[PDB]
């Protein structure tokens, strides 16, 4: 019998392959459709088990698709006959057929895109009535019904996006009252007891999504159901499921933003949200906070001259209470960074905590990228606070204790030394975090800003020594750049970063400090000045506007030379240049001589011969040879 | 400073309004100790505060949670919080060490006699004390190990009382009959084992029977539910309605997962002591998977990570009989919404790894079930493409083993099913091209804007949508794409490249499964000797559809000689060569009767992508 069924299905599908023939009228008979559905259900059930003979698997597999396509084609005629559509949907969702794109591609282009305000309200009401209790429809059917309910509303919102306060004639009063009665007004005595059926969570999430969409896009139509909506949202918060609870929070936040509520509800919801610790639904909490917090001052005004808002102390309260949990700290920092203006006033109780937790947030040994981003973000937050204070003063305010500033500066120096990215350079062989961190470091040390701390600040001896004077680092720097084995990229990156750090810090130092500490500068820079690597030389000597992001930080060598009164440094540099040129390492000697000549021409006179010998022997010779070879090619 | 001193003297002379003031002062000191947690004056405060706390703690247990009872409960909460919240590190200037014996003994006695909402904090405090103050408190681990052994021994009787023999107005039971402390114990025990080493060799032998009995523990109601479900031939999942206290069942399952994690941790080196207990691991694991409440997704995630860690130890061979049982999607996932929306990739990836490692000894029915399940998974509409990539890679790897089945018909049918699934995926990818292009452009523009994101209507952002946005036009966002930072075009190209790589291997495997004597090869060119033969009338359709749909998915790479690299690049050209090479390994008759049909469609397709 299965072979006969397959042949009949194949012949029927072959028929109507050319709909432009008026030969599709045979599809209107209902007994034929019912019998087709019966035989299809039987054949599909047989397929589900490995019951068909081993020679008849693929033909039946294809006959199933043919049957589904024929059913969709039959439904296409007379779209308004929603009874057939509902029966087919119930069959699909009841594990009787196999879903095919034809059903959805028909729903779209026949119902969702129907060019009439009518035939949308009828469909919405029938779908709600099917949803509105009445049983006789499993949860999967309810979800697939919401699948068709929501797109109609979305399309209606789309088609009425214009200036003249376009009204939603589709969203008449009757439809809204029906939604209220069927979803909002209905108070479930014990919806928990109904949890003993599967897939209910999906229906609840779908109704929550519908409510959120309708609010966000038609807030001007809920003035007669504000109270019912609030009761609905508060009631659904009790759900034990995580995603449903967070969706309810999102909905209540939407309403709070788009309506007026007693401050008690806002405070309760906000406090409950802050205590949240589960890693699931983080984005939902982020959206809820982004919707709620900005309009908090309007919802919670404070007395003039009062700088202790309850909502301002609450984050501090939780920070103190749950300080043992790192995830809470990360969440509250993420929330805080996004809104610096609101907490500029209350920074008094936050700046010290931020400075203290800086170390905890990112582990110096090996942190994660998100931790690094969060640390840099809170650093930029405090920098923005300082800039705001300075701008307000220009257009006895709290200032951070010197100990906190020192700790922040040293941690920032260590972090930038340890950073992953490499500072861009003209000589790099063929970065945002490094640029931002260096820019922040430069901005902070300005004179009117914390720059007054430079005088008492040393040269970070521990960091600079451990990063530059290291024997492994020393030999790698003295190693051949050609050899990959001695080309440790991480050590080179750290050396470059610390070199930029010392350049920036010396740009602010005092000539007296440089003259006094000359031995230390010589000790630290002796290894690098001898390096035969172009990047190190460019870091030491070159200084361009393009690579500094509009920062006028003159090179280290130029600064130290200008510090010398119009000495020992000049003789040391001359000796280094002489030994480098003699050894055949032109890269260092040429740069050193360039800087020296830019300082005082008198010293290049005794060096002329070495430069001339190098030029006549190696550089120009090889350049001309290469270009002659290119001409030959 | 005066406020603290007056509060301290009031507390000292103590031995509603007065108790409320004392609660406020004590818990405010708890909150504000950050100004005084670290300092040279700590010894004075420590020695002055221990006696009062010890003296007050000697009173009888208080179970009511209202009025002055709640007041004193809060007093104790924010008083004992000081011990945990203090800087108890092992630094040289630690001052709690010389005065720890009496207080730790009193805390152990409190754990013995206190209640849940006190014993939990007491045991946590003891664990943190032992973590740092083990220098001179090393001699009292015997009492702690005896107490935890007593708790693990009485777990059975408390379970019996709570299941078999079974807010302000409530009465707080004793902590000895609470599953919360039992569930929290294993982490503390592991930490203690980490700290010391002098009491680990002999105590594990005593622990092993206790963990075995606990894991074997079961509820009669759920047991009979499972038995009746098996009798009916079906499988029962969820929570048995007979359970009057659902929270008790959830706590029992939480304790079970914690104990399973402890067993996985202990299996690292002490596996020799648990050798006899291996055969009961799979049945128990499936029982826990079936019995886990839907709401508690964290328990399911813990079970998945624990099972992965168990698998990594090369003990997969024992799971073979239950491989078929685990495949049923109901057993592995359940009805959880959060689970189904977040954790499916983890469970399916671990299952795929387990199947791949033990692929050698699979029976035909298991092969069929895995093929069906993962071909269904390949069609999932998950937002990303890592899940689909993993499914495709697993199917391609299993294709090699599918050719070894004793019966050639089954292997040929399964390979054909794999090819048909790949063709359907190609069609699905084809259907989404315009939406992917539009989303890529919109993402580029949005990233260019570089402004903070807000979830509200905006006249500058008209809400454009199309066929592919049928169920993705609602304000809620389960996971923001911004975190993913994903470009649809790149992901589609990645998946297409992976499938193209796998297709050649699949066809080569199919090339060595012909039924001998099916067709006659008396005279034929040597170029057509080892190619596959014997295609019915329903497989040529599959091959033609595969070619037609695959050739059209090259739009994602958007005169012809192109002597230099222009228009088409090296990647596209080599991919085209790889795709074309596949059809060099089929019967010449099939080649002719396929291309004589598909040539005009190709001629039409060339107009849109000239590189074809």
Tab-separated table of C-alpha atoms in Angstrom, chain A residues 262-272 274 289 292-304 306-319 332 335-336 339-350 385:
chain	number	residue	atom	x	y	z
A	262	UNK	CA	6.152	56.047	42.588
A	263	UNK	CA	9.801	56.224	43.595
A	264	UNK	CA	9.358	53.196	45.870
A	265	UNK	CA	8.846	50.825	42.931
A	266	UNK	CA	11.825	52.252	41.040
A	267	UNK	CA	14.068	51.970	44.096
A	268	UNK	CA	12.937	48.414	44.858
A	269	UNK	CA	13.457	47.232	41.278
A	270	UNK	CA	16.854	48.931	41.043
A	271	UNK	CA	18.085	47.479	44.341
A	272	UNK	CA	16.882	43.998	43.383
A	274	UNK	CA	21.910	45.332	41.538
A	289	UNK	CA	19.852	49.324	33.620
A	292	UNK	CA	16.210	52.732	33.949
A	293	UNK	CA	19.226	54.568	35.378
A	294	UNK	CA	19.394	57.649	33.086
A	295	UNK	CA	15.919	58.893	34.066
A	296	UNK	CA	16.556	58.096	37.731
A	297	UNK	CA	16.973	61.762	38.812
A	298	UNK	CA	13.520	62.568	37.429
A	299	UNK	CA	12.052	59.530	39.194
A	300	UNK	CA	14.075	60.231	42.374
A	301	UNK	CA	14.660	63.976	42.783
A	302	UNK	CA	16.784	65.053	45.731
A	303	UNK	CA	16.657	68.185	47.921
A	304	UNK	CA	18.727	71.123	46.646
A	306	UNK	CA	21.867	67.433	49.188
A	307	UNK	CA	24.659	65.185	47.886
A	308	UNK	CA	23.621	61.887	49.529
A	309	UNK	CA	20.918	60.306	47.346
A	310	UNK	CA	19.621	56.956	48.550
A	311	UNK	CA	20.136	55.481	45.081
A	312	UNK	CA	23.670	56.897	45.250
A	313	UNK	CA	24.416	55.116	48.536
A	314	UNK	CA	22.836	51.828	47.409
A	315	UNK	CA	25.668	50.934	44.971
A	316	UNK	CA	28.147	51.724	47.745
A	317	UNK	CA	26.107	49.572	50.130
A	318	UNK	CA	26.216	46.571	47.790
A	319	UNK	CA	29.899	47.174	47.023
A	332	UNK	CA	28.716	47.304	39.186
A	335	UNK	CA	27.159	49.811	35.099
A	336	UNK	CA	29.086	52.716	36.646
A	339	UNK	CA	27.275	56.968	33.207
A	340	UNK	CA	30.052	59.231	34.540
A	341	UNK	CA	28.012	62.436	34.633
A	342	UNK	CA	25.484	61.103	37.146
A	343	UNK	CA	28.142	59.924	39.616
A	344	UNK	CA	30.539	62.855	39.195
A	345	UNK	CA	28.834	64.440	42.211
A	346	UNK	CA	29.145	61.337	44.421
A	347	UNK	CA	32.660	60.371	43.271
A	348	UNK	CA	33.699	61.224	46.850
A	349	UNK	CA	32.847	57.706	48.052
A	350	UNK	CA	33.774	55.968	44.769
A	385	UNK	CA	35.899	63.178	36.540
